[PDB]
Design a protein around this ligand. Structure first.
Ligand SMILES: [Br-]
Ligand SMILES: [Br-]
Ligand SMILES: [Br-]
Ligand SMILES: [Br-]
Ligand SMILES: [Br-]
Ligand SMILES: [Br-]
Ligand SMILES: [Br-]
Ligand SMILES: [Br-]
Ligand SMILES: [Br-]
Ligand SMILES: [Br-]
Ligand SMILES: [Br-]
Ligand SMILES: [Br-]
Ligand SMILES: [Br-]
Lengths: 146, 146
């Protein structure tokens, strides 16, 4: 229902905002050439957010929501980071490189379970999720959907 | 109450996680010589966090918590950013300077209302909050306390 969608979308937006902590940790680790999850301590679990985790190799962030939001196995949204292939007039986006000092701006793309391709402006597509998200797109902000 | 203080501290941890988006914005603006609040917007208000605001001239972040955490007027934490005067041969910490291209590591210090002074390692004290924080330190993580 539209009302049920409202409850879920509001709670999913809160989870995305709580994941700013992970986006910062990934940026700090990228700036030092460290594994992307190194030193990251996620905020306390809430009634809506079960966990926020970082993939140490790619910097992908996975947000798992509680049953108040979505059923288990259909409850995970992912954010994928990328950087331009070169800072000045890039021709493409690339995944982060573990171990490399990368201090430029990271672009984060949100993927819900229905989103089958990257949709970003120039310089174009970013990487796809490492671990597939499972949250229904209708419960996530529009930038996460197919 | 010990339990209530523990619950409050957990909710303050949520607000500190939300405030990572402001810390990222300050760092991006410092690297570009822009006003420190440029292009940032307080994440959605939550049951625990009223607002997160950046001072455009200093980069200090004010986090205001709801009554679920502390009473109105006793509910704010301030995060203060600083950099060394010289990254390679430092003698002191200094406040951020709007308009300077600052690409080094920014150190953030958290202040509760009853934290009397900056307490950072060498090269020494960072700046104090421009306006007084009001959250009691017992409701905040230890790094915010006297
Ligand atoms: Br939440
Ligand atoms: Br993690
Ligand atoms: Br970034
Ligand atoms: Br698609
Ligand atoms: Br471009
Ligand atoms: Br929405
Ligand atoms: Br919150
Ligand atoms: Br962010
Ligand atoms: Br602001
Ligand atoms: Br209080
Ligand atoms: Br230093
Ligand atoms: Br008190
Ligand atoms: Br704590």
């Amino acid at each position: 229902s539209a009302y049920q969608d409202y409850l879920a979308r509001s709670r999913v937006g809160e989870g995305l905002a709580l994941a700013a902590s992970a986006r910062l940790a990934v940026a700090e680790n990228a700036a030092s050439g460290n594994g992307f999850s190194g030193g990251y301590v996620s905020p306390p679990a809430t009634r809506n957010v079960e966990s926020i985790r970082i993939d140490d190799d790619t910097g992908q962030i996975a947000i798992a929501f509680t049953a108040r939001v979505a059923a288990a196995g259909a409850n995970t949204l992912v954010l994928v980071p990328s950087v331009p292939d070169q800072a000045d007039t890039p021709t493409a986006r690339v995944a982060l490189s573990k171990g490399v000092i990368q201090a430029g701006t990271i672009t984060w793309e949100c993927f819900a379970g229905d989103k089958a391709s990257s949709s970003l402006p120039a310089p174009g597509a970013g990487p796809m999720p490492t671990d597939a998200p499972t949250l229904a797109g209708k419960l996530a902000p529009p930038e996460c959907r197919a």
